[PDB]
Amino acid sequence: MTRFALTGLAGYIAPRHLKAIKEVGGVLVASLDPATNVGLVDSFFPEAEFFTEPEAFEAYLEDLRDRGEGVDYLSIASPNHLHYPQIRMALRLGANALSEKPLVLWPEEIARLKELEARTGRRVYTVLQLRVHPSLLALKERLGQEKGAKDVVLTYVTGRGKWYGKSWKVDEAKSGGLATNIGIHFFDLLAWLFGRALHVEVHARTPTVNAGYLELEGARVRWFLSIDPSFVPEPLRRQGKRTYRSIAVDGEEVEFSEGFTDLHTEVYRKTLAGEGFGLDEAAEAIRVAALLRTLPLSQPSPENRHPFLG
Amino acid sequence: MTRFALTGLAGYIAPRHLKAIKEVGGVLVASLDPATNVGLVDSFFPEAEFFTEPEAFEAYLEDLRDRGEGVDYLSIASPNHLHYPQIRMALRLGANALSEKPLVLWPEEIARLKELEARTGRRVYTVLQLRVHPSLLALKERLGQEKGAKDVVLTYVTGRGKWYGKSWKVDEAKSGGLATNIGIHFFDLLAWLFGRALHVEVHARTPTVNAGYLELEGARVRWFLSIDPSFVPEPLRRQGKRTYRSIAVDGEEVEFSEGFTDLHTEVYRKTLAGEGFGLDEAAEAIRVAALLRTLPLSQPSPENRHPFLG
Amino acid sequence: MTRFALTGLAGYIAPRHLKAIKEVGGVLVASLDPATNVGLVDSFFPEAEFFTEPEAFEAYLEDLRDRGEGVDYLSIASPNHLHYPQIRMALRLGANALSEKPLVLWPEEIARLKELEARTGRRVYTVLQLRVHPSLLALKERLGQEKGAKDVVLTYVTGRGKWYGKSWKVDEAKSGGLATNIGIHFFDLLAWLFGRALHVEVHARTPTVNAGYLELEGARVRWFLSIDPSFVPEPLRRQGKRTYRSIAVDGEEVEFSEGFTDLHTEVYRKTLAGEGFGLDEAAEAIRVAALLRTLPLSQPSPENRHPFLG
Amino acid sequence: MTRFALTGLAGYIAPRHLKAIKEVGGVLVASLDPATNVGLVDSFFPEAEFFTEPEAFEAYLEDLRDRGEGVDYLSIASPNHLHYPQIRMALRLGANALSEKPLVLWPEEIARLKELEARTGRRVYTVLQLRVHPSLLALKERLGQEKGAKDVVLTYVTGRGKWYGKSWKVDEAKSGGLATNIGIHFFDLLAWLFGRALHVEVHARTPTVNAGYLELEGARVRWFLSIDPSFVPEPLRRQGKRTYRSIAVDGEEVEFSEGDLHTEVYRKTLAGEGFGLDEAAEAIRVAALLRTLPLSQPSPENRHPFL
Numbered sequence A, B, C: 001m002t003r004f005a006l007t008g009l010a011g012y013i014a015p016r017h018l019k020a021i022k023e024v025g026g027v028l029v030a031s032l033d034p035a036t037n038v039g040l041v042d043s044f045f046p047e048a049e050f051f052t053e054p055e056a057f058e059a060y061l062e063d064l065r066d067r068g069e070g071v072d073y074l075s076i077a078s079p080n081h082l083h084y085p086q087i088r089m090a091l092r093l094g095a096n097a098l099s100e101k102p103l104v105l106w107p108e109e110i111a112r113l114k115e116l117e118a119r120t121g122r123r124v125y126t127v128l129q130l131r132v133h134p135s136l137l138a139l140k141e142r143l144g145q146e147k148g149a150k151d152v153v154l155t156y157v158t159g160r161g162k163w164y165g166k167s168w169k170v171d172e173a174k175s176g177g178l179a180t181n182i183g184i185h186f187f188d189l190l191a192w193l194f195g196r197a198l199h200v201e202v203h204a205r206t207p208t209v210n211a212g213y214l215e216l217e218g219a220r221v222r223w224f225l226s227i228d229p230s231f232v233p234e235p236l237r238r239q240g241k242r243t244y245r246s247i248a249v250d251g252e253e254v255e256f257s258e259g260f261t262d263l264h265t266e267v268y269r270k271t272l273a274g275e276g277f278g279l280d281e282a283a284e285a286i287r288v289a290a291l292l293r294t295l296p297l298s299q300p301s302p303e304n305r306h307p308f309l310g
Numbered sequence D: 001m002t003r004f005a006l007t008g009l010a011g012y013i014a015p016r017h018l019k020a021i022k023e024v025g026g027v028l029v030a031s032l033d034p035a036t037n038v039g040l041v042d043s044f045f046p047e048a049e050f051f052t053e054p055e056a057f058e059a060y061l062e063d064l065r066d067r068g069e070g071v072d073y074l075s076i077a078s079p080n081h082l083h084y085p086q087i088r089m090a091l092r093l094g095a096n097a098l099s100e101k102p103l104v105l106w107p108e109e110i111a112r113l114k115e116l117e118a119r120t121g122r123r124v125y126t127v128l129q130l131r132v133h134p135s136l137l138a139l140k141e142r143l144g145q146e147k148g149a150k151d152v153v154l155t156y157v158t159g160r161g162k163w164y165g166k167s168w169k170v171d172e173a174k175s176g177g178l179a180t181n182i183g184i185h186f187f188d189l190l191a192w193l194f195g196r197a198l199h200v201e202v203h204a205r206t207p208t209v210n211a212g213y214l215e216l217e218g219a220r221v222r223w224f225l226s227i228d229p230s231f232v233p234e235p236l237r238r239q240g241k242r243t244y245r246s247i248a249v250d251g252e253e254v255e256f257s258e259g260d261l262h263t264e265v266y267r268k269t270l271a272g273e274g275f276g277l278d279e280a281a282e283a284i285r286v287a288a289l290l291r292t293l294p295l296s297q298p299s300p301e302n303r304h305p306f307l
């Protein structure tokens, strides 16, 4: 049984990690979370230890290591800014890391972790589940058959109620900003499908809307991201729908369904089989997100302006 | 359309409150919780306000009240020691209070809420779902048919992993202790079936077990409470059970480990129709738990001793 | 003997409040703060009650009131975004409020407080110690003696090390931003001296620097505000000084880096003597600070530019 | 210049650590505390880094050493239950530790630290200022110029208002209980003066009082500890004194109610004369026994007067 510890046990995404650890036959040995509604853990791993203090959690896994029972993986589902130091914890404990996205917030942290992987003999992986979504895998094989850059329009609107503005997720120093926190997976999907960003522009940057343009090696991309559910197109909004994804590639919609229940598990599966997404796979989206977070706004040309920008 | 606010939204029991508010066709106007994994609320009430600061939640509700739009109920699912001051907030805001058990921790607090109900024109109600469990309402019907006090064996085992001992639930000043935080349900069930407690003894009192004997108007009761999954009887531990709740009366036995899904809803239904559990109904279990809190351990006569003790 | 309760006991400013209350012959009945290094309080008011939960602090004060022993004042030293809801608490308890600056973050809040004072017959005061600084009182007396617009240069450097960036003080939602949390002192000084701001520009807004230009009824004002200690005039840096506050107006320069030891007690004295700063006195600086918060940066004309951006 | 990092910067005792570091020529390079009224630090070490997340502080310190700029000491002033894990962080970073009392909460943690010291070549020290108090260094003096068991009465009343009951200091899992959190100083003083405890009893253990009786190699000791100020003897009381610390040894009283001892401790620690695991271990063993022994009824001759 591969042996896991987990951070962020009380959070929204952690149950998918409990399910994944179970479904690959792993065992959860310990969890860390300063918050304590975590009792769902009893249904999966009735024996797991639990800590509220990071140093106590670390001291415990270090004793496990020192007496031959260390965890193989620290799975990390804490707020975004804690990814890097908790990955650093995984490696100093002689463990591999399996971190929620964004893997870390800064290109400079990716580099530092490259070095520590070397000197530590351990590896850093990340959960990028769009990469295992069967429609998007299908999209990538097709594109492999095609010549020429694609023109892409990417839209993602994901309504959040009021609690969202009271959470770490809108605190730029913890979340990296809207584009990072609700965008990272789409910029990662774009890098995966279309390669490196030669040019990056940001055209709107407010508390509820980020929008802009990328020129990547394989695509020109106009993109729009929002947490305000009224950018949902009116035919779906009159239905009380709260979200809307759409990637169109050369005017054609890319149909990937919501229905998928298993993608965290598939990621965990790939990772254990030595096919996981490492620092090299993750880095380009992080680099773009860091630029998006820090670049001054620019005025878009008409070719370059997302349609929702008007 | 009854208007609710709710405290402790991120917690373990909150989701059953969100379902009861929906199912009774109320609307959730605002929630408070310093912890912010609360996004499940979007699935129910995508417009509700949200606060992490109680003073700000209170000023918002007060504004609504002052402009004629105040909530009807404050549903309270925060840790036990805050039930009382949040019920006080409820009344001072013009809302009835609908509070998780233990309604409050101390009988002196019960008596203060009685005065205040009078000065504020609103009511304090409590969630005592064992009182609407159909097997127990059934058990109560049979008991009413018979003359004489009954001899009762009450066994309540609810396994918890290590997380429980890092939570407020084991902090006696926040939870009132194991016999309050878990036991109040059964002390209240026994008050409802058998009336007042004439004599109370505690025989064991450790971080994981509490046990003792009560003489109530209608019954003699030996009781055993534990958070150690190991006291679940062997036949049920084999099939993976962590929770065992049984009352045996003269030797007829009812299991009620099961069937709680939407008993919260039913409590909400009764409470809205004016047949809710008020301060008069809740006081006696509260008085008993408070006594069990300060009481010195005593040696049990063998007729007074629960069978899981020896 | 004036009865006080206090919020924010564990913080940087609270010790001036303890001293103020003691020195005007007040007594501290109770305090509130989630944080608990507050033991200094025993050496002022060894019997005061202490709460970490706002709802409990409030129920307690309300009991005191209900039995004819309410506090006379709630002194408020919590983070800036909590001022409004805590003054609302004080008034709903039949106490006056004496709040730290900024009295509140939003002008519209000043208008609700005004209505609550009439209903209540209680008053909301604020701590504006610059208005009692002898150097600034004397400046104001001299300026009284001459008609015509004044030409003003205001420099306010309050050097802060790295800890400041992890504090609520740099979280815009809680502090209002540098120009509010520190700036309000000098925007209020300026309003007090020269009246209403007719025109407002912001030239720099970074994490350590805010600067801009005002035109008020009585004066034009070039201002610069920084928490970077490198901005202290070299001559004074040489000497270990980390804070520099001066106002230069028409051929005279008044320094006010020091002289603050007793100013909080003098504010309490004036307020207890019915000469405190109320909503009317505080509102203009609050209005300007709220404007500065949202205004887009603009290119300064050279004559409108503070010399430190020079 | 000796390089320190500090934990617990926002708390009650931290300013004595800032003063000590400054006064022995040290430099504070970084601090950790989840709480943020820490601005006092700018008037000592205006350049120090500051962290609220332990993992982030530790990554930073590790970076410092992965490139030759490590701290030499980690000064630890966080709640008691965090001493052990923070000392571990110190040793794992290649730094020595200088931890507030009690050094750790359990005897078994002492043994594990002793192993880590050997693996690492680094050392764990602790702040036991009563050992540097000139009035107790002088009691110890007079003492070792006679043998034979002493008869000792220890009274330690350290008055605290209502805020104390809302603090980690009364949470037994964090503080170890009253006899540990306050008691450890006098249990250590006694072990230092009189050696190992051979017999231990507890006669009262309430939220405000712990009292009992010890027999040590060199003394019998009746002891009483309270955070309730009303146990200050009615003479010193009617005048609003709120702390009283007395050890009477065969009828003669030394009083240590009123205090720079932290600096002396840092000095001796950096001078190679600090208080290590060996020194700290006995008080820790006794405090652990008392947090856990069942109460017992004292014989009259073994019962502290104040009972």
Ligand SMILES: NC(=O)c1ccc[n+]([C@@H]2O[C@H](COP(=O)([O-])OP(=O)(O)OC[C@H]3O[C@@H](n4cnc5c(N)ncnc54)[C@H](O)[C@@H]3O)[C@@H](O)[C@H]2O)c1
Residues within 6 Å of the ligand: A007, A008, A009, A010, A011, A012, A013, A014, A032, A033, A034, A035, A054, A076, A077, A078, A079, A080, A082, A100, A101, A102, A127, A129, A167, A181, B036, B037, B038
């Ligand atoms: N793949 C997806 O579909 C998906 C969806 C949501 C979130 N996420 C990602 O998962 C991570 C968690 O997001 P969440 O949505 O579950 O947010 P969350 O706020 O619901 O959960 C956060 C949890 O982390 C805890 N935490 C805070 N500090 C910690 C520490 N020092 N150590 C351990 N735990 C700590 C908090 O108490 C909280 O319980 C984020 O990185 C986010 O980007 C991914």
Ligand SMILES: NC(=O)c1ccc[n+]([C@@H]2O[C@H](COP(=O)([O-])OP(=O)(O)OC[C@H]3O[C@@H](n4cnc5c(N)ncnc54)[C@H](O)[C@@H]3O)[C@@H](O)[C@H]2O)c1
Residues within 6 Å of the ligand: A036, A037, A038, B007, B008, B009, B010, B011, B012, B013, B014, B032, B033, B034, B035, B054, B076, B077, B078, B079, B080, B082, B100, B101, B102, B129, B167, B181
């Ligand atoms: N009938 C049942 O089956 C049942 C089961 C579990 C719990 N409960 C009761 O429900 C209440 C909650 O229990 P829980 O299990 O969900 O514990 P929990 O720890 O999971 O949930 C606690 C929630 O309260 C929040 N909280 C803390 N302070 C608050 C404040 N000042 N205002 C608002 N919220 C605050 C915490 O952040 C947390 O999110 C308790 O009274 C418990 O006795 C009943």
Ligand SMILES: NC(=O)c1ccc[n+]([C@@H]2O[C@H](COP(=O)([O-])OP(=O)(O)OC[C@H]3O[C@@H](n4cnc5c(N)ncnc54)[C@H](O)[C@@H]3O)[C@@H](O)[C@H]2O)c1
Residues within 6 Å of the ligand: B055, C007, C008, C009, C010, C011, C012, C013, C014, C032, C033, C034, C035, C054, C076, C077, C078, C079, C080, C082, C100, C101, C102, C127, C129, C168, C181, D036, D037
């Ligand atoms: N006039 C001045 O020179 C001056 C100086 C500093 C602060 N102030 C003002 O005083 C207030 C406090 O500033 P601070 O310097 O002392 O910063 P601080 O961060 O040092 O102290 C803040 C205290 O508020 C507490 N707190 C948080 N939430 C609370 C709540 N709901 N109720 C009660 N307390 C709560 C925190 O735990 C902390 O102990 C701010 O408004 C600030 O603008 C004025």
Ligand SMILES: NC(=O)c1ccc[n+]([C@@H]2O[C@H](COP(=O)([O-])OP(=O)(O)OC[C@H]3O[C@@H](n4cnc5c(N)ncnc54)[C@H](O)[C@@H]3O)[C@@H](O)[C@H]2O)c1
Residues within 6 Å of the ligand: C036, C037, D007, D008, D009, D010, D011, D012, D013, D014, D032, D033, D034, D035, D054, D076, D077, D078, D079, D080, D082, D100, D101, D102, D127, D129, D181
């Ligand atoms: N020798 C003495 O006279 C004396 C006096 C007080 C305390 N102490 C010891 O010092 C330590 C601190 O006591 P205190 O009086 O100053 O209590 P305190 O509660 O005033 O200070 C505690 C500080 O620790 C911080 N903290 C909490 N978790 C932390 C973490 N993971 N990392 C860093 N800091 C964290 C808190 O935020 C707080 O600022 C305790 O061991 C106490 O026994 C010694």
Ligand SMILES: CC(=O)N[C@H]1[C@@H](OP(=O)(O)OP(=O)(O)OC[C@H]2O[C@@H](n3ccc(=O)[nH]c3=O)[C@H](O)[C@@H]2O)O[C@H](C(=O)O)[C@@H](O)[C@@H]1O
Residues within 6 Å of the ligand: A038, A039, A040, A041, A042, A043, B012, B101, B158, B159, B169, B181, B182, B185, B243
């Ligand atoms: C009826 C009753 O006694 N209610 C009390 C009872 O709650 P309930 O009935 O739901 O316990 P049960 O185990 O049957 O839950 C089913 C699942 O949820 C999981 N569970 C349960 C509790 C929890 O906090 N977290 C959690 O994940 C658990 O792992 C199970 O798998 O114990 C709580 C507690 O001591 O904490 C008390 O606060 C309640 O007042």
Ligand SMILES: CC(=O)N[C@H]1[C@@H](OP(=O)(O)OP(=O)(O)OC[C@H]2O[C@@H](n3ccc(=O)[nH]c3=O)[C@H](O)[C@@H]2O)O[C@H](C(=O)O)[C@@H](O)[C@@H]1O
Residues within 6 Å of the ligand: A012, A158, A159, A160, A169, A181, A182, A185, A243, B038, B039, B040, B041, B042, B043
């Ligand atoms: C794939 C992807 O976009 N991942 C990101 C995505 O989450 P996901 O896709 O699951 O949300 P989706 O809208 O599809 O609905 C799921 C349901 O749960 C609700 N939801 C959503 C987030 C949350 O914290 N809580 C929550 O209840 C929501 O109301 C729905 O009802 O948004 C997160 C966020 O917005 O913070 C990011 O942190 C993630 O990186």
Ligand SMILES: CC(=O)N[C@H]1[C@@H](OP(=O)(O)OP(=O)(O)OC[C@H]2O[C@@H](n3ccc(=O)[nH]c3=O)[C@H](O)[C@@H]2O)O[C@H](C(=O)O)[C@@H](O)[C@@H]1O
Residues within 6 Å of the ligand: C038, C039, C040, C041, C042, C043, D012, D158, D159, D160, D169, D181, D182, D185, D243, D257
């Ligand atoms: C030597 C010794 O016993 N040390 C222990 C002792 O501290 P010390 O000697 O400093 O307190 P003394 O009673 O002499 O009061 C001094 C003044 O400060 C105030 N004081 C005191 C403690 C506090 O936490 N806060 C505070 O303001 C108090 O109000 C007085 O005004 O109590 C601590 C505690 O209670 O936790 C333990 O952590 C220490 O290890």
Ligand SMILES: CC(=O)N[C@H]1[C@@H](OP(=O)(O)OP(=O)(O)OC[C@H]2O[C@@H](n3ccc(=O)[nH]c3=O)[C@H](O)[C@@H]2O)O[C@H](C(=O)O)[C@@H](O)[C@@H]1O
Residues within 6 Å of the ligand: C012, C101, C157, C158, C159, C160, C169, C181, C182, C185, C242, C243, C257, D038, D039, D040, D041, D042, D043
């Ligand atoms: C009058 C005025 O400008 N008030 C504002 C001003 O505070 P004040 O005048 O006291 O600071 P000054 O620069 O003189 O430092 C004095 C010493 O204290 C130390 N100091 C200072 C602030 C602090 O938070 N902590 C601290 O330890 C500092 O290291 C110095 O050693 O900054 C506060 C803030 O920065 O948030 C605002 O909340 C105030 O409203």
Ligand SMILES: [Cl-]
Residues within 6 Å of the ligand: A050, A051, A052, A053, A056, A057, B166
């Ligand atoms: Cl822990």
Ligand SMILES: [Cl-]
Residues within 6 Å of the ligand: A166, B050, B051, B052, B053, B056, B057
């Ligand atoms: Cl809020």
Ligand SMILES: [Cl-]
Residues within 6 Å of the ligand: C050, C051, C052, C053, C056, C057, D166
């Ligand atoms: Cl409280």
Ligand SMILES: [Cl-]
Residues within 6 Å of the ligand: C166, D050, D051, D052, D053, D056, D057
């Ligand atoms: Cl940090």
